[PDB]
Amino acid sequence: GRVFAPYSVFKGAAALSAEPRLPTFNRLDSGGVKLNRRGVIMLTFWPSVGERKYDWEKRQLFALSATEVGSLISMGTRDSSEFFHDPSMLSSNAGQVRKSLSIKPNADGSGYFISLSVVNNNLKTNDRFTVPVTTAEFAVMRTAFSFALPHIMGWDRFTNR
Amino acid sequence: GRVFAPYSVFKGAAALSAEPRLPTFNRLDSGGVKLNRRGVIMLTFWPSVGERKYDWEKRQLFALSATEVGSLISMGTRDSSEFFHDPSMLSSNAGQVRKSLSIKPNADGSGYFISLSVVNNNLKTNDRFTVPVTTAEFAVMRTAFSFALPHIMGWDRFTNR
Amino acid sequence: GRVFAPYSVFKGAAALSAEPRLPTFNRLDSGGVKLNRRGVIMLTFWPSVGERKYDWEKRQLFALSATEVGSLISMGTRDSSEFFHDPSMLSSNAGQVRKSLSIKPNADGSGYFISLSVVNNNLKTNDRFTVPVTTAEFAVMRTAFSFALPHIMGWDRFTNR
Amino acid sequence: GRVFAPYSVFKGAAALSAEPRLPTFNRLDSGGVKLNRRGVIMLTFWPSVGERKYDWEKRQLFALSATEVGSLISMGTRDSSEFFHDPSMLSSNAGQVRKSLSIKPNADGSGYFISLSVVNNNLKTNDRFTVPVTTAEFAVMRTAFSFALPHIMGWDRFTNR
DNA sequence: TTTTTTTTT
DNA sequence: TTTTTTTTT
DNA sequence: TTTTTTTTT
DNA sequence: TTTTTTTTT
Numbered sequence: 146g147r148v149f150a151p152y153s154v155f156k157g158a159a160a161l162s163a164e165p166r167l168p169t170f171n172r173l174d175s176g177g178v179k180l181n182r183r184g185v186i187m188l189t190f191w192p193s194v195g196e197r198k199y200d201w202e203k204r205q206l207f208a209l210s211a212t213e214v215g216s217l218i219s220m221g222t223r224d225s226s227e228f229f230h231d232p233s234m235l236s237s238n239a240g241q242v243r244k245s246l247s248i249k250p251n252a253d254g255s256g257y258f259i260s261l262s263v264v265n266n267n268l269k270t271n272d273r274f275t276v277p278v279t280t281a282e283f284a285v286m287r288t289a290f291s292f293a294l295p296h297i298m299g300w301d302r303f304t305n306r
Numbered sequence: 307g308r309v310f311a312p313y314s315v316f317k318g319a320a321a322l323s324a325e326p327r328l329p330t331f332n333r334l335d336s337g338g339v340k341l342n343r344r345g346v347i348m349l350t351f352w353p354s355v356g357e358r359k360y361d362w363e364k365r366q367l368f369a370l371s372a373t374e375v376g377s378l379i380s381m382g383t384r385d386s387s388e389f390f391h392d393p394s395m396l397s398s399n400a401g402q403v404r405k406s407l408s409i410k411p412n413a414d415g416s417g418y419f420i421s422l423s424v425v426n427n428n429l430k431t432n433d434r435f436t437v438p439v440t441t442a443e444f445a446v447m448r449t450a451f452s453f454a455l456p457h458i459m460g461w462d463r464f465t466n467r
Numbered sequence: 468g469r470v471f472a473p474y475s476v477f478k479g480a481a482a483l484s485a486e487p488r489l490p491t492f493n494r495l496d497s498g499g500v501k502l503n504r505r506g507v508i509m510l511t512f513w514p515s516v517g518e519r520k521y522d523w524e525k526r527q528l529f530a531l532s533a534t535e536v537g538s539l540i541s542m543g544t545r546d547s548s549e550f551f552h553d554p555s556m557l558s559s560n561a562g563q564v565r566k567s568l569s570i571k572p573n574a575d576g577s578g579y580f581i582s583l584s585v586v587n588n589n590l591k592t593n594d595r596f597t598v599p600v601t602t603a604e605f606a607v608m609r610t611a612f613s614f615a616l617p618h619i620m621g622w623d624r625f626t627n628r
Numbered sequence: 629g630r631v632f633a634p635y636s637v638f639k640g641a642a643a644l645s646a647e648p649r650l651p652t653f654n655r656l657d658s659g660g661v662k663l664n665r666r667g668v669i670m671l672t673f674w675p676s677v678g679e680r681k682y683d684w685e686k687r688q689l690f691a692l693s694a695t696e697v698g699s700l701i702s703m704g705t706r707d708s709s710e711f712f713h714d715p716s717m718l719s720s721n722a723g724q725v726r727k728s729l730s731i732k733p734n735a736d737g738s739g740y741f742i743s744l745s746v747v748n749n750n751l752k753t754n755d756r757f758t759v760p761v762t763t764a765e766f767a768v769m770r771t772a773f774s775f776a777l778p779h780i781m782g783w784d785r786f787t788n789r
Numbered sequence: 790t791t792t793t794t795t796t797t798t
Numbered sequence: 799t800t801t802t803t804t805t806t807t
Numbered sequence: 808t809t810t811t812t813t814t815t816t
Numbered sequence: 817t818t819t820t821t822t823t824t825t
Contacts, residue, residue, distance in 0.1 A: 147338035147798075150329070150460035152372065155795055162796080165464045166809075168472070175816070177469035185809065191796070201796040208809040211474065215606035230810040244810080284376035285455065292456040293464065294607065295614040299472035301466050303487045303615065305623050308660035308825075311651070311782035313694065316822055323823080326786045327791075336798070346791065352823070362823040369791040391792040405792080445698035446777065453778040454786065462788050469816075477813055484814080488800075490633070497807070499630035507800065513814070523814040530800040533635065537767035552801040566801080616768065617775040621633035625648045625776065627784050630807075638804055645805080649818075658825070668818065674805070684805040691818040713819040727819080 151189075152289060154282050159274035160199050161259065162189040163286065165293040166208070170302075184297030186214055186290055188246070190261045190274035205263045205272060207246050214294050217248065218287045225249040225257075241267045256280045312350075313450060315443050320435035321360050322420065323350040324447065326454040327369070331463075345458030347375055347451055349407070351422045351435035366424045366433060368407050375455050378409065379448045386410040386418075402428045417441045473511075474611060476604050481596035482521050483581065484511040485608065487615040488530070492624075506619030508536055508612055510568070512583045512596035527585045527594060529568050536616050539570065540609045547571040547579075563589045578602045634672075635772060637765050642757035643682050644742065645672040646769065648776040649691070653785075667780030669697055669773055671729070673744045673757035688746045688755060690729050697777050700731065701770045708732040708740075724750045739763045 151164045168184040191204040209217070213228055220226065230244040245262045260275035278286070295301055312325045329345040352365040370378070374389055381387065391405040406423045421436035439447070456462055473486045490506040513526040531539070535550055542548065552566040567584045582597035600608070617623055634647045651667040674687040692700070696711055703709065713727040728745045743758035761769070778784055 148460075148463045149338065149798070150341040150463060151796090152459060152461075153795080160795070165461065167464055167466055170466070173816080177471065177816070179816090180472040182809095187809070189796090189808095193795090197795060199795060204796080206808055210810085211607050212601075212603050215610065216603035218610065219602055219606040228810090232808080232810065234810040235812075239810090279373075280380055281373050281377035284380040285372050285459075288376065288379065288452055288455050289459060289461055291610055292461060294610050296464060296466060298474060298607075298611060299466055299470075300474075300487065300611055300614060302470045302472060303489055303618060305489055305492070305618060305621055309782075309785045310660065310825070311663040311785060312823090313781060313783075314822080321822070326783065328786055328788055331788070334798080338798070340798090343791095348791070350790095350823090354822090358822060360822060365823080367790055371792085389792090393790080393792065395792040396794075400792090440695075441702055442695050442699035445702040446694050446781075449698065449701065449774055449777050450781060450783055453783060457786060457788060460788055471816070473814090475813080482813070495807080499632065499807070501807090502633040504800095509800070511799095511814090515813090519813060521813060526814080528799055532801085533768050534762075534764050537771065538764035540771065541763055541767040550801090554799080554801065556801040557803075561801090613771055616771050620635060620768075620772060621631075622635075622648065622772055622775060624631045624633060625650055625779060627650055627653070627779060627782055632807070634805090636804080643804070656825080660825070662825090665818095670818070672805090672817095676804090680804060682804060687805080689817055693819085711819090715817080715819065717819040718821075722819090 152285060154276060154278060155197070155199070156276050157193065159190055159192050159276050161274075161276040161278070163187070163289070165297055167296060168299040170299065178302070180299045183211065184299065185209055186293060186297065188261070190276070192274060203272070205244070205261055205274065207244055207261055209246075209290075211294060211298050214290050214297070218290050218294075220248065222254060223250055238267070241265070251277070256283055313446060315437060315439060316358070316360070317437050318354065320351055320353050320437050322435075322437040322439070324348070324450070326458055328457060329460040331460065339463070341460045344372065345460065346370055347454060347458065349422070351437070353435060364433070366405070366422055366435065368405055368422055370407075370451075372455060372459050375451050375458070379451050379455075381409065383415060384411055399428070402426070412438070417444055474607060476598060476600060477519070477521070478598050479515065481512055481514050481598050483596075483598040483600070485509070485611070487619055489618060490621040492621065500624070502621045505533065506621065507531055508615060508619065510583070512598070514596060525594070527566070527583055527596065529566055529583055531568075531612075533616060533620050536612050536619070540612050540616075542570065544576060545572055560589070563587070573599070578605055635768060637759060637761060638680070638682070639759050640676065642673055642675050642759050644757075644759040644761070646670070646772070648780055650779060651782040653782065661785070663782045666694065667782065668692055669776060669780065671744070673759070675757060686755070688727070688744055688757065690727055690744055692729075692773075694777060694781050697773050697780070701773050701777075703731065705737060706733055721750070724748070734760070739766055 151162045153162045169182040185208040188207040194200040227247045243264045256279040263272040312323045314323045330343040346369040349368040355361040388408045404425045417440040424433040473484045475484045491504040507530040510529040516522040549569045565586045578601040585594040634645045636645045652665040668691040671690040677683040710730045726747045739762040746755040
């Protein structure tokens, strides 16, 4: 069965959620197993419609790859990164939706800003959710993501008993 | 069944103990599972009534959240933090008991001081337990807490087999 | 059964793959178990025959030992290392094939270069596969290898239940 | 059953071995479980009687506690520590055997020196085994010991399923 | 005994 | 296919 | 719902 | 064979 144990951070404008999506495996005819669809750390964003009350309907997703996770956890305090995703890459309708996730340190050094930009040329929409992440919150993420990385990679299958 | 494997540090005035409290889950009707009550790292303090002989009766608890754990493990040597808790928040009798946990580096750099303050306006009591933590002891905590963080978050449920 | 969950990095000239090989154990007559053949992190390299299309036939392997893994993960940004292996050491045909793996930081600091040299004096061949590894990619490796190290050592057998 | 998966380092004068000893638990009448005898990282030393040929008969043991492990893994490159143990503390024959383990960085910075001193006033013996540990070897230890620490503490018993 | 709360499947 | 070897239970 | 793809067993 | 001990459920 599925499991819902998100690490969620709520702030002024929007809320931020993070939970792993494990890899899918195919059992070969030879008996062994082969990783098929790679796992990710799924990031979800949604806005606040009212004093601490958020709109789950207007949520946007962003799937961190193994490498991108590696990038995030290796970030020094004075570091910043930006990831660009096309949800429908290699599909009939590519270049129509563009997603970009950005992590930038804030001036104070009291953590980072993490914002998701989603531009949809099909629906003519332009969404952006920014969420402030303290040092401690980003620390949970770094440690949690470090823990999950081997799993989303399927390396937890390698075990002596 | 339950499990009692505390990491305990004993010192002059008081003693310090730390062990995880796992999250509670509810099995949905849909089959999947959902994290309900979040896990914590439970901290217990108690005084010394006599030459190395402590009073377990006068113990006070403090429950570290995921974020607070993230804060503790991310602490540089020259860092200090303070957490404030109301045990009965959102309850009939709030603001009546106040707890504060403080981690401050000591002058020497030979670790930290960790003290729990508990002010009870109902019972008119004022308790404070301070415990010195060497670099090595705080190292156990940092590593142990890092290990436990994924578990108290319920991320150990995400596993390939 | 076996498991195939490689961490693969594809680049211009060649491709790089990494996955653990667990240790083999023998069950003693006394009942206990004893680690026999030590585990490794297996590295595979292969060339590119055409615009992003690689030759799996011309692959070369390199097996990182526990210690060598320890070396790799302890590398600062400004560090470089080189490992020399004779595949047929202590065998009839030693000194006939020589392998060397090198990790050097690139000028920019944007990661490392990792190249495998294989000199075969029996077949009169001289192969070399170089692959550029970004900071994020090497971060995956560092974290993945850290996770796997206890397992290839067989220390995952030590567990309370 | 027991498990033998030592991390061993062999050098000129002596050899060094390290493997965890898990904690013992007692099942309470209440149903739960309680950690009884604490786990350790067991260190074994033995001399070399001949060109790369060691004397397993003249081995000496040293049991690292949780805290001492915490100390070892927190060591910077320029750090050194010394631990003193009386094997028969709180026993009929205390003060008769004294053990001391020392970790000192070597001049070059190419790792550390680790030596075990055992003075026996009952048998009138004075033993000392020194073993050089490269940066990579000590890296294996740091990572392996970090992995094992939660287990020797019995914190691996805390798990969601 | 424990600072709660915010959104789904 | 893989750099081995050293000491026990 | 999710940026894909490249090579085996 | 191993530095112990301190307080509960």
